[PDB]
Structures are given as C-alpha cells and as structure tokens.
Design a binder for this molecule. Structure first.
Ligand SMILES: [Ca+2]
Ligand SMILES: [Ca+2]
Ligand SMILES: [Ca+2]
Ligand SMILES: [Ca+2]
Ligand SMILES: [Ca+2]
Ligand SMILES: [Ca+2]
Ligand code: NA
Ligand code: NA
Lengths: 343, 340, 343, 344
C-alpha cells in the first residue's frame, strides 16, 4: 500500500540488508562489538561531540539523557507540545523522578523570555531546574523547523544558569536539510542530542545520543538499567552506519514530495496549507468533508492509502524513502477520486 | 512586626495552648487525634479522615492513594501542587502533572476534558484531577461552585478521581456562602489546612472514603508522617476546626480594607478582586521591582513575600489587627513617595 | 493495662506539658521558630555535629538521610534485621530509588569484612554503594548495643571507599547509658545520625537528624518534599528539649527494670536470657510453652499485659518511663500464673 | 584467537541466522505490524504454553517490565539472595518500579518454600505488600544449577494461596529443560510469567522474550514502551530469534557435555571443582589450593589464551556455548594443567 502514516515505516535498503548479513559483531556489554563502536565513533564525529551511545529507540535516547542530566526532584523545561511530554508514556516521572515544566512555543520555538522565566529560583519549595529540552523539526506542529537563533538564545540562558540543554533531534537531519544549518552547528548549542536512525534515515532499529564523555558514561549506565544493553547489536549498527552516512542527502526528496503532495491536494480542494509544509509532513483538515478524519482514513485505506488521524478533524501525511514520486502521483489520483465522493 | 507574608504565621490562641489526652497514633490509640479525624470527616460529609503534619503531605498522600506509577494528574497551571511542593508528585508517586490554564483557579471544564489522555500505549493514564480552592497564586480567589460541579461531572464520566486542595477551603466557604460539605460532595478527597487561617500550630487533614483513607494512611507511614502522641497537636486542631472558622470574615474585611486604601495611595492593586484574605500588589509602576520593594517594606516594619519579579502577595490573618493594617498603610503611604 | 509493647507509648511528663503550653514559636518554614532552632542547636552540639534537623518521625529522619546521601539506583548496605529494611514501608525504594543490600550481623554488629565485601565494584551491572547504615541498640536482636569498635572499623572502610555512614540511633541514648560511650563519640565515626525523642526520652512527637551543614540542607529540602515541613512546631520542640536534656539519665531505670523482669521471668521458668539484656528490651521465647507467641500475646492481653510477638516463637517486652517497678512486679505475678497454665 | 569461557552471551550468529536477518520480512512493531516479530511471539507463547508473548531487547528489560506489570510502588519482591535481578540489574527494580527486594537464601538456586512462605509480609502499616515472587531457572551464581519442578510447584501453591504473582527468570530455562527433561511449558505452568533469553546459549545476536497471559503482556508492552524497548523494524532481530527457538535448543546438550568434560578433567588435574554439581553449561572453579587469587588466575589464563570471569575473590566461572568446541575445551584443559604446575 502507499504508507503516508509516518517515516517510521521506512524499510531497509538493499545496501543495509547486505551489511547486516556480513556485519562483524561482538558483545556490546563488554564494549566488544566493532560495528556498534564504529557507529558511535561516526555519530560523535558527525555531531562534533566527544562520545556517543546507540539505543534501541528515540524514547530510550531521550530518557537516558534525562536520567544522565538530572537528579530526583529536578524540573525539566520543555515545549508544551513536545514528544517527551506527550508521547513518552510519562517516563520522565517514573524513570528520573523529575517534573516537566511545559512552556508554550510557536511551532516548537519557546520564547527565550518564557524559558528564562520558567527557571526556578533557589528556594526550599521549588524543584531545581536542571535541564531544558528543545525538539528540532517539532513533530506536533507539523514538522516545523526551530530557528537556529532560538536555540542559540536558549543556550545562552542555560549557560548563565548552569542548566543542561538537550536537543530532541529525532528529525534533526530534516531540520538541517530544510534550514541549511549543519547538524554540528545545532549540536554546538547543546550538551546532548538524540537523533533517530529509524525514521527518515531508514535503519530498522535505533537512535543515537551524543554528548560529553562523562554524560555518555552516565547515559550508558542508565541504558543498562532500562534494558537497552544488547549483545551482538552490530547487526543493527551496520544498517545504522549506512543510514547516518548515506541516507541524509536524499531527505531533500521527501521534503520535495511533501510539498508537491500538499500543492496538489490544495488544488483538488482539500483543506491543506502548502505554505506550512517545511519538511516531510502535511496536515490535512477534514472540516469540509462528509466524514470526519477517522471515517476518511478508512476510505483512504480501502483505496490503497494509509494515513493516521491525529484528531477528529485532522490527518497527518508523512513522506519518506518508501514513498516515491510515482507513489505520490498515485496517491493524488486516489485523493482526487475520494474528493468527488466525500466533499 | 506587621507580618503579611502568609496566614501560616498565626500563633496559637490561649485556649489552644491550654488544650495542648494522648496515645500512640501508630496503634490508632490517640483519642484526641481520633476525635479530630472523626470531627473532620463529619464536617466534610466524608467517611474517614487522616491527620497529617502539613498540607504538602496531605496533598501528596492523596496523590499516592489516587494514582499508580506513570499516571498523569490534571491540575491548574498555577496550582500549589505544581509550583510549591518541591516536585514531590514525580518523586513520590512517579506521576506526571498535566497543567491546564485556569482563570483565577478555574480551569475551563472543556479544557479539562481535552487534557484527559485517550487509551494509547504512548500515553499515561489520567487518573486524577486536582482543583485548588481559594486559589493562592491568583490572589486567594474563590473557584465557583459551578466550575467544580462541571469538572466533577466530567471526572465521573471518565472514572477519574477528583481531589480538592482545600488548604483555604473555609476562606472560600465564608466568602461564597457555600458549605464545605457541599464543596466536598463534588470531590473524592479534600485536603484542608488547620495551620493557616484557623490558627493551629501544626497540621492539616485529608478526608475521603474509608478505603482511600486507609491507602493514604499507609502512604503517610511511608512518608514519615506517622507520629506518636500527636494528640497534643490535634487538641489545637479541634479548636481550630470548631472555633476559628467564623472569624475568618475579619481577615477578609482587613484584606479588602488594605487593598482599597492601597489603591487610593496609588499602588497597582485591584480591590474588586479581593474577596478572601489576600491582596496581589503589582510593582510595574514603582522604581524598584518586587524583590527591591519587599526589602524596603522589611526595613520599615512590614513583612511580605514576592511571588514573581513584579508581584507581591499580602496575606491577612488573626495576628494582624485592623490597627496593624492601619499602621501598615501609613508605611505603604510613605514608601509610595519614595518609590513611585 | 501494663504496656510492654514498646517505648513509643511513653506519655509527656508534667514538665513537658507545661513547656508545650508556654512554647515560644515561629514559622519553621522560614526558620523562625526559636524553640525548634534551639532544639536543633542543642542536638547538633550534643552529637558533636555542625547542624541538625527536627522531623515528625524516626522513619522520616532515616528516609531524608537516605535521600540526602544517595542518588537514584544507588545501593545502601544495612544490617539484615534492621528497621530501615523491615519496618519502613519500603520507603527507601520509593522515595530514593535505592536498593537495600542486607548484610548479616551478630546482635546488630555486621562483620567489617562482610561490609567490605558487600561494597559493589565499579561495573555497569552494579549500583553504586553510597551509604552504609548501622542501627544502634539494634531492635530485632533485643535492644543490643553495637560495640564502638565495630562502628570505628566500618567508618574506616567507608572513608577508604568514599562512602557515607548513617547511624540509625533511634535508641542511641539507651546504647550510650549501657556502654558509657558518649553519643558524640558514636557520631564521630558517622556522617549522620538520626535519634528519636519520642521513645524512651518521653517526648510526644519527633526525632532529629544530625550531620554536616550541606547534608542537613539537602535533608531539610527532602523533609519539605516528604511533608515534614511544619509551621509552629516549637510546641513539639519544647518537649523535645526536655527529652534531650533531662530524660537521658533516667534511662538507666528502664534498663534496671528490664534486667529485673528478665531475671524473674527466668526464675519462674520462662525461656529468657538475662545475660543478653543490657538495655530496655527482653526477648522471651515460647519454646517451652503449650502455645505459640501469638497465642501467648492474646493470653497476656486478656490478663492485663500488652506486648508484641516478633516471630511465631518469640515475643518482645520493652520497658520505659510508663512501666514502673510496681508494674513489672504486677506483670510478673501474671506471668507466674500463665506459666502454670501453658508450661 | 582466544578460547572464550567468560559467558554464553558471546555466541555469534549462525550462517542461517545471518541470512534470515538480512532477508527478514519487517514492519513497524509499534503498530504491531512486523510479521517476523509477530511470529516469534506466537511461537514463544506456544512453546511455553501461554496466551501471549513480548519481544524485548534484553533479558534485563524482560525482567524489569515483568516486575513493573506485576507490582505497585512500595511492593516487595521475594527473590533468591544471589539472583541476577538483585545483583546484576543495576538496581532497576527500585528505580523503575519503586519496589524492595526481599532476599531469601537458596540452596543451589532453590529457595525453600517455607522460607518463601515466611518472607511474605503480614498486612501491617509498617510493611510493604508482597506482590511478586521471582525464581531463577538454571540459577547462574550457583553454577547454572537446575531448580527442580517440584520446588517451583510448591512455591506456586503458596503464591496462589496468597494471591501473589510468580515470575520465572528463565534466561537459561532451555538449559534447565535439556538437563532435567522437563518441557519448558511445565515450568511455565507454575508461573504467571517467564522471561527467556535468545541471545545466550541459543545464539541469537539480540533479545529475549516474556511470556504470560494476554492482559499481563499488554501491561508489559506498555512498560516496554516507557523503558524504550519499543522498536520499529525489529523483525531483523526476530528472524534470528525464530531460528534460536526452533533449531538451537537440542544442541545445548553439547554445551552440557563439554562443561561436564571440562569439570571432570579439571578435577583430575587437582583444581577445586565439583563435577557432581555440573549439570548445564557452567563450571565453578575455586582457587583455594592455588598460590594466587581469583583475579590473578584470570589474568594468567588471559596471558595463555583463555578468557574467563572471576565471580568472587576465590571463584571463577567457566561457561560453555556453541562457539567453544570440544577441541577448544581440550586446549584450555591442557593449559589449565600447566598453570596448575605454576600456581599450586
Ligand atoms: Ca524504519
Ligand atoms: Ca499557624
Ligand atoms: Ca512517646
Ligand atoms: Ca512495689
Ligand atoms: Ca549471542
Ligand atoms: Ca585436541
Ligand atoms: Na538522583
Ligand atoms: Na504504582
């Protein structure tokens, strides 16, 4: 089918499948897997950091980072619509015993003044603000790119207060492709960065956390506690190396396809705003249709297109490697036919 | 000094000092604690009650008794549980707060409904909604009974518990005319303070169903609130609950007078917003910010707390007489000349 | 009834009642209660430490100490039969996220070599051992006194590893009166000590934690989090000062009464060991009786004597200010009658 | 290269596994759409006679999500005093679940049922609630010892009477089964949940599986999401797991035969080992009759081409697995014989 549900559904490339088959492995618990070691070395190098740690998921990447940055009772400033707050099962409270301090943002960009104001003064009644998290290409807002200046401004505030900064860069390469800002530049204004290998980059499993050597050592211990300490994970790391080193540039194609899809959907008559499409996500409202988002998703599935409803009136369409321009053209033919039925 | 920092500074009345029969509460044998809890449960129309050393403990054992690890707790964005309880909900219960904006403590029921998490693997389970009555941060504002009723209805629909942080619920009752028993009927649990406007030296009480209170009592033991001959404290608590409620009206009168007169001097206050024992004073029209003005106030005989860089909270209580208020106003008058 | 269940049942003396009624108080949250401040000053001085913190209970005292000494995932070495492990509702795991590491002891004295062996090596699989707790006048062994030499040897081991030492001194003054070792000497070989005011010292409520200034500041914030931050607690502190300054010497009376009780129980024929009784507790075994401990407790209760069973064959008898020699004599007459019935 | 007797975790994928992983049919497991993971879980559930199963990236995660699903904050978990959950899982039970471990000493990994019974907390405000009893099968620390089915049966009876959950840390449960002749479904029949590893003796590169009732597995799956074990196209890993379960269990007998040979021969040389205690893939060697300690002996073995781990200042653990052949065992033995001349 034509899967526009998310970029998480990307499948391994033929190059990845071959590398997994001949991957050199070892027990990572002993630090003896050569491929995992190389993946971490490459990731550290790529983001200009001292060290890196491979994890089974972006969620674990964010959570081990929070654990490594905080102490029980601490508070973590984060954007009110960020993944760490909305889609990580309340893990920060259970695993680290910390409280989130949601700060509103405009498409992922928290006003530097609101962030500075959310920092807790030193008082017996108050938690200690020890971490500030920023999400780049903010998911909930529709894959928007957080301006480099916003990140730089918040980094300055953090520095003045002795507060750590973590960038949830699950889709940081999409941000870099859209903005022209190198990932090293983003990373320089953060103490840690988590980036996904299993979304737009097409690896089957995993993410990576990069940061200072001492922070990574603490995160590695947290990873062991959480259950992310695998054995011969080099099989996964082999695909990860290809994802990191060879699948970044083509993300531009996903952006082009998302924009083309949006422009054409608007032409048909669907409620979409092509001007809001900055990366690989398109938000489709169903207010003008005879059925709501849930009913329209079912009609789409019957015609060969998969998508998710994110509310009763909104559907999200996400492009990726496994959605070609031909697939986009085919999907548009289907959307055209469904508009005749449901407008 | 003229202490306007909080109503927590109230000292025991002579009758409280004399009242302060005991036993070991761990064995449930302190008769005065037992009578205090019996009286509290009766007053709020609940099955059981639990004495605790502080309102923070009262709120926290209630959260522990209402939730499981990983749950989410809907609460007002400027509520005490979120801002002034040291992140205890995350450490003690492993729960995540889900702040919802409110207008003077009143969360729009529709916003509360939208904050409830659907059943999905990525989401915590919303198991509790907390409402703070006479919302501190907004100036000791009274949350409308209709707001609480509506939220209770939503909670019922979804099978979610409701906890009322009633640290100053009697102040609310006195101002609104709504009996505390009526407020409590729309909640599963209520925590109310004995150590603030009611003048007891120590403690608060949590009221609710018998099974919830049993869970809260075990949580209290875990937290370290299981005392021995606490009847010494309970004796003052009974007097606070049974003899000190009516006079809260005097604190409201003094707060309103203070606010009215401060407005006349020229300070940035809103006398029409003052319905209980608190006055929010803004410093945007002064030459110094809240922290600087608090220091000046201290040097002239007046104690108050800054609640932000531009806001000061003034609180009245039994130990601040009308004469004290008049004396404070003379001081505020002099300081307006200096910093305006 | 004649209460031998625990020394927690002690009621305030007339002196304490007057002091509580006349207590000079203030708001302790602002550090303004003069009586709490004097009690803490006196407590610190008495234990030879720079700071102290009054708490509502010994459990809170131990738990805030654990919170202030550890970080999530740490391990706490403690005696296998200690109160922190058995009677504190699993608080160490919930509040501090730490693991207990039980070590056997002989009457509360953990073999120093066993303690050194229980310290975890630096390995990703292992928690960090950051605290060693020692209980003085170890309850479960029968109110036994831990030798100063034992604490001294453990202190040296702790210093070598950079590990903190906490003494659960709930009944430390009973230990001091029996051994002749000043409480400041026991405390000199520990980082922190918690002692109770509400047991043998007769105060109605509370305990105190003593230690270094930084540690106490962290313990004070932990106390706020747990809910032990009270307002005009000077009412309780007034009785606390009398407990500390005027009720220590008379503990020797409780020790004398416990010894007399044990000797006479042995004379009657009960299975007791007077040679093991050096403080205010007597362990009585029901081995030679036609009933188990629980059934014996019931028989005692029906005859006017209260006590607790500590196992299916052992019951604990505890003396205190509120059980006089006359009461011990009357209890013995009852014990004599019951021995004829169940022996 | 060196003879690695450090652990069975070092097993490398077989040629068949490598091909199945690279060519695995995958999908997004978060949506429950990876066909290979789904088949691995179906097969695992069936093998253990349970309704459901959950793939996890490690045995530690398997145990921890099970503890999370079986307990509430403040609960106590009875477990053997030398078990992996207590010693080698980074204190995770306290941090993740807020539960207290209640160690019960065991005899060769087996806790006496009456000691388990006595460890259950009475209902009292001072005591945590005992909600889970964990049993480790082929108990590692004692030397890969096999816990009898009757021990597990008796504990199950006690747990049922008290309404307590039972979890089997079956990291090496197939080793127990091969040695005892007891099908794994029989061990599992006396437990609410069982975690078993695919990445040790079964030779898969990554992961373990938890089996149990549908509702428990659903709760464990949500715990897995929270801990970060919710992967995407994990079918790549599951492909090797299916082969581990279907083709690598019977040969564990070879690992046991190799360990028995190793022990018998080490005894003949003069080392302090007990061949009579060796029934699975582990041999405990004490250094009591050597003029060196445990760590020093490990260093000497390393210098001679043999890798092992010290588990005490006087104990070393030798583990056999697919990647150590009988010829490798003979080589190690010949070296052990000589190093016996140097250190005795
Ligand atoms: Ca993927
Ligand atoms: Ca007061
Ligand atoms: Ca007492
Ligand atoms: Ca007499
Ligand atoms: Ca392996
Ligand atoms: Ca050979
Ligand atoms: Na911590
Ligand atoms: Na729970």
């Amino acid at each position: 089918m034509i899967d526009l549900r998310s970029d998480t559904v990307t499948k391994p490339t033929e190059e990845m499948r071959k590398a997994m088959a001949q991957a050199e492995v070892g027990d990572d618990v002993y630090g003896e897997d050569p491929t995992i070691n190389e993946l971490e070395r490459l990731a550290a190098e790529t983001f200009g950091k001292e060290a890196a740690l491979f994890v089974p998921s972006g969620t674990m990447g964010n959570q081990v980072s929070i654990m490594a940055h905080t102490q029980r009772g601490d508070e973590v400033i984060l954007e009110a619509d960020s993944h760490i707050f909305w889609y990580e099962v309340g893990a920060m409270a259970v695993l680290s015993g910390v409280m989130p301090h949601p700060v509103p943002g405009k498409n992922g960009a928290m006003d530097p003044d609101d962030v500075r104001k959310a920092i807790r003064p030193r008082n017996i009644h108050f938690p200690r603000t020890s971490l500030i998290a920023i999400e780049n290409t903010h998911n909930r807002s529709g894959g928007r790119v957080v301006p480099l200046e916003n990140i730089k401004e918040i980094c300055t505030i953090a520095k003045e207060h002795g507060i750590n900064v973590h960038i949830d860069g699950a889709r940081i390469f999409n941000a870099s492709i859209a903005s022209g800002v190198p990932v090293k530049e983003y990373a320089g204004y953060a103490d840690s960065v988590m980036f996904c290998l299993s979304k737009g980059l097409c690896a089957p499993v995993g993410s990576v956390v990069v940061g200072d050597r001492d922070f990574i050592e603490r995160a590695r211990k947290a990873r062991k506690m959480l259950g992310g300490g695998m054995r011969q994970a080099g099989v996964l790391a082999a695909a990860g190396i290809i994802a990191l080193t060879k699948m970044v540039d083509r993300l531009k194609e996903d952006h082009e396809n998302a924009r083309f899809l949006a422009l054409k959907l608007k032409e048909i008559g669907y409620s979409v705003n092509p001007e809001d499409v900055k990366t690989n996500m398109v938000i489709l409202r169903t207010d003008n249709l005879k059925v709501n988002a849930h009913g329209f998703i079912e009609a789409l599935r019957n015609s060969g297109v998969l998508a998710n409803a994110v509310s009763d009136t909104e559907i999200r369409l996400v492009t990726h490697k496994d959605v070609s321009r031909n697939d986009i053209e085919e999907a548009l033919n289907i959307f055209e036919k469904l508009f005749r039925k449901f407008s």
